[PDB]
């Protein structure tokens, strides 16, 4: 066991679970929505080409990010 | 024992480091064996549950 | 230019980065800190002066008397460190304190004193820290570890969503003072700001803003922005406010600005700001949700239409509008950025004014008592704004001002209204998203104490205890003839310091395994201890490494196990601030040029700068060579332009600690392997003969010198006389200090016992008539080698399986390593025979021992003690002691036996001191201690006359060496100007202190040196007298002990299976076999491999550093063996100079340069002879040898570039397929020995209350068969195994003896009875009121 091999397993699980959470948050494959689900605005072309399947424009997205930063 | 403590607390201060039992028996009037047994009288032994 | 002890053996050094800041004195913490403590602070702010100024001047009851502190000094001790360790006491100094007492009459309060009295009273002894930062507290050597505790100031921390179900984070700000109450602000889940004063009941936060005499209009002016509407129903507009999801659309001048419902955006914000829109119009319904800002009344009756913080509805809008009201002010309470919190808190806030708020505070603090206006106001003002009850210290105010981002590092000590309003704004701002919480393991919140500050605190505690008694004694009588000696008894002042230095979690035995262990144990920071967190409450919080640890704490080095991250080690260049916060040096970077001067930055400042990397290439003018240089800003590391960077790391090593700086190729190891490797280097016991690492770093000389193991010169000179015990140096005449005699003596520390029973022993390095320069080492300490730290030995290791003999982590050691005594360690252990006086008389150290039959008494001399020179084994009698006793009525058949043989009873036990089992050493020493009552025995008078002759000889031999040196200097003075050069030797040496010379200042010199030798004579005389007094004077032994005989058994432990070898890269093992040398793998030249290793350990444990080290050691040894071949065939120094100089410049642009061309032809032969075992090599920690230079250095020898040679099997001699890796790894013998562990017991001692076998190997104890072993036995069917482990082998006092009788009878059956543990349980339940019993069978 050596006490660093188990530490290795712990670190491996920690990094992998973090990596895959931050990957699942991407949702690359998606739907062409074409209009914001918050303000109905035109989600500009470049943002839909970068993130296929967005649901918020950058303004509503950053807004939501602030709140989910604090919590709730 | 209270008198021994008093005389020692005074003598250590006035005499320097500490009173050796010959010095206490001289300063006191005791025969210096009584003083030694008074010193050897144990004190408040200990809780046997003390940590190690 | 190379030091003369440096040209002896030059470690070749990779590490292309040029070194700018040379490594500090590694023990600066301990020594600096204890310097500040016991030292005459003239402007008293440090150490004893501050404590004395803080208690004094004491003033008497009604000011009749004043006890005033004049000054202190430290009386010189009674014994030095060696004498303290022998005698067994704390090496301290008396604290003699000159005090003054002035007494006043009537009508002269400050007026003329009736009389004063001066006297130097003695208040306790402070232990003295030795020259290494260690104390001697009870004869043993302690180290006081530095502590790491939170500092005063304001801390912003959140629950990070754990507490509330929704997850909503709740931010609190805490003002922790130095002394005083803990103001704390914290959010409610409804986002109401509360304040609690001492972890007491929660109050609304604005209750305290009213307590500071504010009103609601003022509070809303402080915390909010006034959206001002005017008049219709027009809105003044700040376009930045409406960032946006926008309520009303937006319009001005009638055309349009934005249409409603769609979210407000940056483009439309641009449009409003561009078209200069100040006033727009909103309806009568949008103003229905805002909050009124201030008072609004009717002029008709002077009646209040609406207060402040009151909701504004359409009715009130109409009512104000009809009052001719054009202006209205509303709180700008956004939901995301400018959140409304003071508004809701003022809602919940029941009070209104300072009176009712103070009453609320009073009820919370002093509850139930009927309050008053005056009592409430007084309590509140005494909370935070009375100077005698609330203190932000200098650290506290520094952190409070800096944490609020103010530029006033210095300030008051009490809070203020503004120091609370800024705290509340910062709290609300953290909640608004501008700003972040504090990290707890952030090293800007935690500061370090050390010996100076902790001891000063204990001394202040003692001083307050003194102040009590002195005030009361100046209360009673105050009569004359009462002086400042009777009022102060030294016991309770010295009591706290004694209790701390002896009995504290931080005063702990220094680890002396080897020098590196001491250097790390002194440079240690601890989060534990009295004042810091406890192991139970820690976390999960401060075990973690934090970005502010860069350059301050070693991320590698820390114990694994119960406290990871609770005990870190100080980094290499880490330092302590003025205030106590850790810091680290950076070379300042002007515009692009990397300036040379260096500033120390602490974790608070280090964030807001941009700090380049130490491995950043540069031009010669100091510019960077890369456009985007990778530097770490506040928390992260990114590529910044070369213009932006402000500071740069002082070195590549500055992130590690001195332990983990000794791992070569540390960059190639997984970080935890580095942790284990460092922690195991701390445990390497020093071998019999030292061996420097063939692959080091260049840290070894620093660790060896800066610790006190090696005797270093103080002044250059010549080695007048060497010896196994002493080195005499005749100084260069440049460094004589004209009063001095010239020569200085170093007395080596011979075979002595360290805390771990190892042998500390210094060996001379220099030889007769050889130069030295100040800073050169004269004596190699334990586990150093020619000045360098040499922990273990460099072995010719092979990596390959070999027959399951290095299977899990085992090691397969050759018999040749066992023959060369490479890992043989001298251990030393002291065994004490205490003869006390029992209640039937005293016990004797006699040799007329009972039954033992004149063979065991063969070693013992007449007085009963073993000879210094005898080799005992386990069981031999070191000290024969016979004890009194009674008769005890020997049973019949013993009566009958002694009646048949007439061997009458002894009456005297044989309670003597025999050697413990398994040890077999030489008795190297014997000390005796007789109390002043007990006369002495023959051995005691013998040892005393021997110590007497030694002391006299030492003093005289020193004095005559010094006299001969001073006569040489006097004769050099007598060469001109009143000169006698050929008759100077004619008259006798003693007729030279009366020598004539012309009337100059140099006949003055002769007379001066003469009278100074007279000083030598007389002070030598008083030295001899005091020495004879100390040697002869009786000892102050503990109460009741007549005398203590201490034998010192020196054992020599050899390597054996079960011993634990280990590498510097976390590769630890356990010798499983000691292979015969012809059974080991050999190469094609006949060379067995010294040690065989498992290649399996390397891939999974990602420490390939041991592989690169094996390759580099193969290269180094290849170089050195080529040198040995040249040096043995007597190749001329042409050949040696050529080859050695070709090997000393290898690698791409290394910093080091050596030119053997500027080398004496004898200094190349010495250097060659030292490089004939192998060329030492250095590899700085993140700077060292690239693999291609390893390959080149292999090509320099005739070794293969691949590093893998082909090996043959020892037993059969057929070549292993697919060649193996063999090089030189540097192994270390860890202090986990197999005979300090192997323990066994059939039947021995049994504990008194619970009749179980004793616990431990020292008690010859049994094994703890616990609960889980019992489940394992129940999971089989072993019903009998368990019944006998629990009954007969443990606790059943009557069945254990019957089992023994049966086993020797050859009848393996147990009648188990019943355990004593259950009997004691039954009696203990019965001694409660319960009646428990065992029914009829
Ligand atoms: C390290 C650990 C073995 C230790 C013994 C193994 C065993 C189960 C593994 C996780 C699970 O599969 C779920 C999840 C699946 C995703 O797809 C990838 C991520 C997750 C978190 C995995 C990480 C890691 O690999 C785990 C902890
Ligand atoms: C190890 C233990 C620390 C527990 C934490 C401390 C706490 C109290 C200590 C004993 C008492 O002082 C009495 C007695 C005084 C003699 O003079 C020296 C021996 C005795 C037996 C001491 C041994 C030891 O030092 C004790 C057990
Ligand atoms: C070489 C030097 C003369 C310099 C002109 C003389 C003067 C002082 C002498 C030492 C002392 O006597 C002490 C000691 C006495 C022992 O007996 C022999 C060893 C010692 C170390 C002596 C060696 C030598 O004799 C010394 C260094
Ligand atoms: Zn949108």
From Swiss-Prot, chain A:
It holds the Pfam family zf-dskA_traR. InterPro entries: Znf_C4-type_bac (IPR020460), Znf_C4_TraR (IPR012783), Znf_DskA_TraR (IPR000962), Znf_DskA_TraR_CS (IPR020458). PROSITE patterns: ZF_DKSA_1, ZF_DKSA_2. A zinc finger (dksA C4-type) spans 36-60. One of its GO terms (molecular function) is zinc ion binding. Keywords: Metal-binding, Plasmid, Zinc, Zinc-finger. It comes from the Bacteria. PANTHER family: DNAK SUPPRESSOR PROTEIN (PTHR38777:SF1), FELS-2 PROPHAGE PROTEIN (PTHR38777). This is Protein TraR. The gene is traR.
From Swiss-Prot, chain C:
Gene3D superfamilies: 2.40.50.100, 2.40.50.150, 3.90.1100.10, 6.10.140.1670, DNA-directed RNA polymerase, beta subunit, external 1 domain, DNA-directed RNA polymerase, subunit 2, domain 6, RNA polymerase alpha subunit dimerisation domain, RNA polymerase Rpb2, domain 2. It catalyses: RNA(n) + a ribonucleoside 5'-triphosphate = RNA(n+1) + diphosphate. GO terms for biological process: DNA-templated transcription. The modification N6-acetyllysine is found at residues 1017, 1195. Keywords: Acetylation, DNA-directed RNA polymerase, Nucleotidyltransferase, Transcription, Transferase. GO terms for cellular component: DNA-directed RNA polymerase complex. It comes from the Bacteria. InterPro entries: DNA-dir_RNA_pol_bsu_ext_1_sf, DNA-dir_RNA_pol_bsu_external_1, DNA-dir_RNA_pol_su2, DNA-dir_RNAP_su2_dom, DNA-dir_RNAP_su2_hyb_sf, RNA_pol_bsu_bac, RNA_pol_bsu_CS, RNA_pol_bsu_protrusion. GO terms for molecular function: DNA binding; DNA-directed RNA polymerase activity; ribonucleoside binding. Its EC number is 2.7.7.6. Pfam families: RNA_pol_Rpb2_1 (PF04563), RNA_pol_Rpb2_2 (PF04561), RNA_pol_Rpb2_3 (PF04565), RNA_pol_Rpb2_45 (PF10385), RNA_pol_Rpb2_6 (PF00562), RNA_pol_Rpb2_7 (PF04560). The RNAP catalytic core consists of 2 alpha, 1 beta, 1 beta' and 1 omega subunit. When a sigma factor is associated with the core the holoenzyme is formed, which can initiate transcription. DNA-dependent RNA polymerase catalyzes the transcription of DNA into RNA using the four ribonucleoside triphosphates as substrates. Belongs to the RNA polymerase beta chain family. This is DNA-directed RNA polymerase subunit beta. The lineage of its organism: Bacteria, Pseudomonadati, Pseudomonadota, Gammaproteobacteria, Enterobacterales. The gene is rpoB.
């Amino acid at each position: 066991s050596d006490e660093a091999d188990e530490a290795y397993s712990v670190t491996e699980q920690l990094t992998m679970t973090g990596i895959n959470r931050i990957r699942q948050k991407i949702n690359a494959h998606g739907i062409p929505v074409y209009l914001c689900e918050a303000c109905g605005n035109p989600i500009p072309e470049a943002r839909r080409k970068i993130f296929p399947g967005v649901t918020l424009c950058v303004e509503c997205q950053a807004y939501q990010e602030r709140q989910r930063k604090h919590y709730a | 024992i209270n008198k021994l403590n008093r005389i020692s607390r005074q003598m250590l201060q006035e005499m320097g480091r500490e009173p050796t039992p010959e010095e206490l028996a001289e300063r006191m009037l005791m025969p210096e064996d009584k003083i030694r047994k008074v010193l050897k009288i144990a004190k408040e032994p200990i809780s046997m549950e003390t940590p190690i | 230019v190379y030091s003369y002890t440096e040209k002896k053996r030059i470690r070749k050094d990779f590490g292309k980065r040029p070194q700018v800041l040379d490594v500090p004195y590694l023990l600066s913490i301990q020594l600096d800190s204890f310097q500040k403590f016991i030292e005459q602070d003239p402007e008293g702010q440090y150490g004893l002066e501050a404590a004395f100024r803080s208690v004094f001047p004491i003033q008497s009851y009604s000011g009749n008397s004043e006890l005033q502190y004049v000054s202190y000094r430290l009386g010189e001790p009674v014994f030095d460190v060696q004498e303290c360790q022998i005698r067994g006491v704390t090496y301290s100094a008396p604290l003699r304190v000159k005090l003054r007492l002035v007494i006043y009459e009537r009508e002269a309060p400050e007026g003329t004193v009736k009389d004063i009295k001066e006297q130097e009273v003695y208040m306790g002894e402070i232990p003295l820290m030795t020259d290494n930062g260690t104390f001697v507290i009870n004869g043993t050597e302690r180290v006081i570890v530095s502590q790491l505790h939170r500092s005063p100031g304001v801390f912003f921390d959140s629950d990070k969503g754990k507490t509330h179900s929704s997850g909503k984070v709740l931010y609190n700000a805490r003002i922790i003072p130095y002394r005083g109450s803990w103001l704390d602000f914290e959010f409610d889940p409804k986002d109401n700001l509360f304040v609690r004063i001492d972890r007491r009941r929660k109050l609304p936060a604005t209750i305290i803003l009213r307590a500071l005499n504010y009103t609601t209009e003022q509070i809303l002016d402080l915390f909010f922005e006034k959206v001002i509407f005017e008049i219709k129903l027009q809105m003044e507009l700040v376009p930045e406010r409406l960032r946006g999801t926008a309520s009303f659309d937006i319009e001005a001048n009638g055309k349009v600005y934005v249409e409603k419902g769609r979210r407000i955006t940056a483009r439309h914000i641009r449009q409003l700001e561009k078209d200069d829109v100040k006033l727009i119009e909103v309806p009568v319904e949008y103003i229905a949700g805002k909050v009124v800002a201030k008072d609004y009344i009717d002029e008709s009756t002077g009646e209040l239409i609406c207060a402040a913080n009151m909701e504004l509805s359409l009715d009130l809008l109409a009512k104000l509008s009809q009052s001719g009201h054009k202006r209205i002010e509303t709180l700008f309470t956004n939901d995301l950025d400018h959140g409304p919190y003071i508004s809701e808190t003022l809602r919940v806030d029941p009070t209104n004014d300072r009176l009712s708020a103070l009453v609320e505070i009073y009820r919370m603090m002093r509850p139930g008592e009927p309050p008053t206006r005056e009592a409430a106001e007084s309590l509140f003002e005494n909370l935070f704004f009375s100077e005698d009850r609330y203190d932000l210290s200098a650290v506290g105010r520094m952190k409070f001002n800096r944490s609020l981002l103010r530029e006033e590092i210095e300030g008051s000590g009490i809070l203020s209204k503004d120091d609370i309003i800024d705290v509340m704004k910062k709290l609300i701002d953290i909640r608004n998203g501008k700003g972040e919480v504090d990290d707890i393991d952030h090293l800007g919140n935690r500061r370090i104490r050390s010996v100076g500050e902790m001891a000063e605190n204990q001394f202040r505690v003692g001083l307050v205890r003194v102040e009590r008694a002195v005030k009361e004694r100046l209360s009673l009588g105050d009569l004359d003839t009462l002086m400042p000696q009777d009022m102060i008894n030294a016991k309770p002042i010295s009591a706290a310091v004694k209790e701390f230095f002896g009995s504290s979690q931080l005063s702990q035995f220094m680890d002396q395994n080897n020098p590196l262990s001491e250097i790390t144990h002194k440079r240690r920071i601890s989060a534990l201890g009295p004042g810091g967190l406890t192991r139970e409450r820690a976390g999960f919080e401060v075990r973690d490494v934090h970005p502010t640890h860069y350059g301050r704490v070693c991320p590698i080095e820390t114990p694994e196990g119960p406290n990871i991250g609770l005990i870190n080690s100080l980094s290499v260049y880490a330092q302590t601030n003025e205030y106590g916060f850790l810091e680290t040096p950076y070379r300042k970077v002007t515009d692009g040029v990397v300036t040379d001067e260096i500033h120390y930055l602490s974790a608070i400042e280090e964030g807001n700068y941009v700090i380049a990397q130490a491995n950043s290439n540069l031009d010669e003018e100091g510019h960077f060579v890369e456009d985007l240089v990778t530097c770490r800003s506040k928390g992260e590391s990114s590529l910044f332009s070369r213009d932006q960077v402000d500071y740069m790391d002082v070195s590549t090593q500055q992130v590690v600690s001195v332990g983990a700086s000794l791992i070569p190729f540390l960059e190639h190891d997984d970080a935890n392997r580095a942790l284990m490797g460092a922690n195991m280097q701390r445990q390497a016991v020093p071998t019999l003969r030292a061996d420097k690492p063939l692959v080091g770093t260049g840290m070894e000389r620093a660790v060896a010198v800066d610790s006190g193991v090696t005797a270093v010169a103080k002044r250059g000179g010549v080695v007048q006389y060497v010896d196994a015990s002493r080195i005499v140096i005749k100084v260069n005449e440049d460094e004589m200090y004209p009063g001095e005699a010239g020569i200085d003596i170093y007395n080596l520390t011979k075979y002595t016992r360290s805390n771990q029973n190892t042998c500390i022993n210094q060996m001379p390095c220099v030889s007769l008539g050889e130069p030295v320069e100040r800073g050169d080492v004269l004596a190699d300490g334990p586990s150093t080698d020619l000045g360098e730290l040499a922990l273990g030995q460099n072995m010719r290791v092979a990596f390959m399986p070999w027959n399951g003999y290095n299977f899990e982590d085992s090691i397969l050691v050759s018999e040749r390593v066992v023959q060369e005594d490479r890992f043989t360690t001298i251990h030393i252990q002291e065994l004490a025979c205490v003869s006390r006086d029992t209640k039937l008389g005293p016990e004797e150290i006699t040799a007329d021992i009972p039954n033992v039959g004149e063979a065991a008494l063969s070693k013992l001399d007449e007085s009963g003690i073993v000879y210094i020179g005898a080799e005992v084994t386990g069981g031999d009698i070191l000290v024969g002691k016979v004890t009194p006793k009674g008769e005890t009525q020997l049973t019949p058949e013993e009566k009958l036996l002694r009646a048949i043989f007439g061997e009458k009873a002894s009456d005297v036990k044989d309670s003597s001191l025999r050697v413990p089992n398994g040890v077999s050493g030489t008795v190297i020493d014997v000390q005796v201690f007789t109390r002043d009552g007990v006369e002495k025995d023959k051995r005691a008078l013998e040892i005393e006359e021997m110590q007497l002759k030694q002391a006299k000889k030492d003093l005289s031999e020193e004095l005559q060496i010094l006299e001969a040196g001073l006569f040489s200097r006097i004769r050099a003075v007598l060469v001109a100007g009143g000169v006698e050069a050929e008759k100077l030797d004619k008259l006798p040496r003693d007729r030279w202190l009366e020598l004539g010379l012309t009337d100059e200042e140099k006949q003055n010199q002769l007379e001066q040196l003469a009278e100074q030798y007279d000083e030598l004579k007389h002070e030598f005389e008083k030295k001899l007298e005091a020495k004879r007094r100390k040697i002869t004077q009786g000892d102050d032994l503990a109460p009741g002990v007549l005398k203590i005989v201490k034998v010192y058994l020196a054992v020599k432990r050899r390597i054996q299976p079960g011993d634990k070898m280990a590498g510097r890269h976390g590769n630890k093992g356990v010798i499983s076999k000691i292979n015969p040398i012809e059974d080991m793998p050999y190469d094609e030249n006949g060379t067995p491999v010294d040690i065989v290793l498992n290649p399996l350990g390397v891939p999974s444990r990602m420490n390939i550093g041991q592989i690169l080290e094996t390759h580099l050691g193969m290269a180094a040894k290849g170089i050195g063996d080529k040198i040995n071949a040249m040096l043995k065939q007597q190749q001329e120094v042409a050949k040696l100079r050529e080859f050695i100089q070709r090997a000393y410049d290898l690698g791409a642009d290394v910093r080091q340069k050596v030119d053997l061309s500027t080398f004496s032809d004898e200094e190349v032969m010495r250097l060659a002879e030292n490089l004939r075992k192998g060329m030492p090599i250095a590899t700085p920690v993140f700077d060292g040898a690239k693999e291609a230079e390893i390959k080149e250095l292999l090509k320099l020898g005739d070794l293969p570039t691949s590093g893998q040679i082909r090996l043959y099997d020892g037993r059969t001699g057929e070549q292993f397929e697919r060649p193996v890796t063999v090089g030189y790894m540097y192994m270390l013998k860890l202090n986990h020995l197999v005979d300090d562990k192997m323990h066994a017991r059939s039947t021995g001692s049994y504990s008194l209350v619970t009749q179980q076998p004793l616990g431990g190997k020292a008690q010859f104890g049994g094994q703890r068969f616990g609960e889980m072993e019992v489940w394992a036995l129940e999971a089989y069917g072993a019903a009998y195994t368990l019944q006998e482990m629990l009954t007969v082998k443990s606790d059943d006092v009557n069945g254990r003896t019957k089992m023994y009788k049966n086993i020797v009878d050859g009848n393996h059956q147990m009648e188990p009875g019943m355990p004593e543990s259950f009997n004691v349980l039954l009696k203990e339940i019965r001694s409660l009121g319960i009646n428990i019993e065992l029914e009829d069978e």
